[PDB]
Design a protein around this ligand. Sequence first.
Ligand SMILES: CCCOC(=O)N1c2cc(CNC)ccc2[C@H](NC(=O)C(=O)Nc2ccc(Cl)c(F)c2)[C@H]1CNC(=N)N
Ligand SMILES: *[C@@H]1O[C@H](CO)[C@@H](O)[C@H](O)[C@H]1NC(C)=O
Ligand SMILES: *[C@@H]1O[C@H](CO)[C@@H](O)[C@H](O)[C@H]1NC(C)=O
Ligand SMILES: *[C@@H]1O[C@H](CO)[C@@H](O)[C@H](O)[C@H]1NC(C)=O
Ligand SMILES: *[C@@H]1O[C@H](CO)[C@@H](O)[C@H](O)[C@H]1NC(C)=O
Ligand SMILES: *[C@@H]1O[C@H](CO)[C@@H](O)[C@H](O)[C@H]1NC(C)=O
Ligand SMILES: *[C@@H]1O[C@H](CO)[C@@H](O)[C@H](O)[C@H]1NC(C)=O
Ligand SMILES: *[C@@H]1O[C@H](CO)[C@@H](O)[C@H](O)[C@H]1NC(C)=O
Length: 335
Amino acid sequence: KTTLFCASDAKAYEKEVHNVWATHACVPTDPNPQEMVLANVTENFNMWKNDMVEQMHEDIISLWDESLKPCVKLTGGSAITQACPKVSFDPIPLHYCAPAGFAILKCNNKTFNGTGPCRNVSTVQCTHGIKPVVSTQLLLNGSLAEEEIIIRSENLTNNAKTIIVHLNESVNIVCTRPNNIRQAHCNINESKWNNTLQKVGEELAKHFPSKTIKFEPSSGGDLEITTHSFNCRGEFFYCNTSDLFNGTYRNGTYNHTGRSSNGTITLQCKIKQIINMWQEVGRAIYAPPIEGEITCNSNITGLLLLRDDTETFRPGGGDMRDNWRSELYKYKVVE
Ligand SMILES: CCCOC(=O)N1c2cc(CNC)ccc2[C@H](NC(=O)C(=O)Nc2ccc(Cl)c(F)c2)[C@H]1CNC(=N)N
Ligand SMILES: *[C@@H]1O[C@H](CO)[C@@H](O)[C@H](O)[C@H]1NC(C)=O
Ligand SMILES: *[C@@H]1O[C@H](CO)[C@@H](O)[C@H](O)[C@H]1NC(C)=O
Ligand SMILES: *[C@@H]1O[C@H](CO)[C@@H](O)[C@H](O)[C@H]1NC(C)=O
Ligand SMILES: *[C@@H]1O[C@H](CO)[C@@H](O)[C@H](O)[C@H]1NC(C)=O
Ligand SMILES: *[C@@H]1O[C@H](CO)[C@@H](O)[C@H](O)[C@H]1NC(C)=O
Ligand SMILES: *[C@@H]1O[C@H](CO)[C@@H](O)[C@H](O)[C@H]1NC(C)=O
Ligand SMILES: *[C@@H]1O[C@H](CO)[C@@H](O)[C@H](O)[C@H]1NC(C)=O
């Protein structure tokens, strides 16, 4: 309803680029913030139609433009060339804050699906700290659901609408290009992956009850969405998830169909130079990888899925606003 501002805990002596941008663009965080509970109120939220998502999307676009300059950017017919130095890149949390005379309602119902009415509501200056993690298929380094796994969708009946699965237990994923320069791999403990898909299948079954629930790799499209893609310490990883989204939940029980070894799933990854941009329809070209080991140790805290008797779910992604939605669902700007 108005224009927000950001508060961060950055330091202008980091030259990690999130820190630098935040020094330029955000104010320091209130050491101890104010919160106003109101369990009588009951307000309506709609995470799918939330202007904070647009504001934050704009901010992260600006952050990436200032911080991860491509050597070349192709947009339409145009090509733009600029210095593309390697940088230190580790996302920091950002808080979004209502300016004087507005507030941010937080919905405190732990099971709120992001849509409709919510009874226990709070007033706050700012959201919690949100790390702006750009990725597809898996949501990384978010904040887990407090009680049960939550299923969010603008419209579960419309299979074209992305499904956000909010996990209550995070699942470690470790990706590494060890010390072919482009080749890398991720490791997930097949045990926790097994459990979490069991319970995701349970919740999906509540929403589609007669059907058997299958998980399958992404059908088609750009590499950025047919693989789990993400930025790790500057470099763009594309990791194959076909041994990950590969299972069946039949009669209250989940069977994993992907292949594992010694009880870990290992995704083959490539580090790529030519990127399909998430900010706009366009391509972006970066320098070859730094040397040394490139490792990210991340928590999977959510999934992005798309639905095609049986119901079949595939990893989705590509519109980074959904990532922001997954974190901003509980908040509204008011007055
Ligand atoms: C118009 C602005 C909104 O742009 C979209 O909405 N796009 C969209 C939408 C869908 C439909 N599902 C909602 C599918 C695929 C895409 C595209 N996404 C990506 O290219 C993408 O994510 N690249 C990437 C790069 C680096 C990292 Cl690290 C990463 F993790 C991901 C994108 C369009 N950009 C393009 N065609 N060049
Ligand atoms: C979310 O909850 C609302 C009611 O609060 C309901 O109308 C809607 O169908 C639910 N959607 C999902 C995906 O659970
Ligand atoms: C997480 O939610 C699932 C399904 O909603 C539930 O079965 C499980 O007990 C929960 N686990 C934890 C650790 O809260
Ligand atoms: C969502 O699903 C379909 C679209 O295929 C349509 O009935 C309408 O847009 C929505 N229905 C409900 C019940 O929300
Ligand atoms: C992922 O790997 C499988 C088998 O290894 C292959 O069939 C599939 O095409 C791969 N997908 C991508 C996007 O690389
Ligand atoms: C599941 O994994 C196996 C081997 O890891 C592969 O042969 C199979 O094609 C995968 N399932 C799907 C639906 O791709
Ligand atoms: C989950 O993974 C563990 C580790 O390999 C395995 O022993 C267990 O049987 C699996 N459960 C399934 C596939 O349902
Ligand atoms: C997730 O957070 C950890 C710790 O901050 C970090 O090492 C890791 O690189 C992060 N993952 C991504 C994809 O940024």
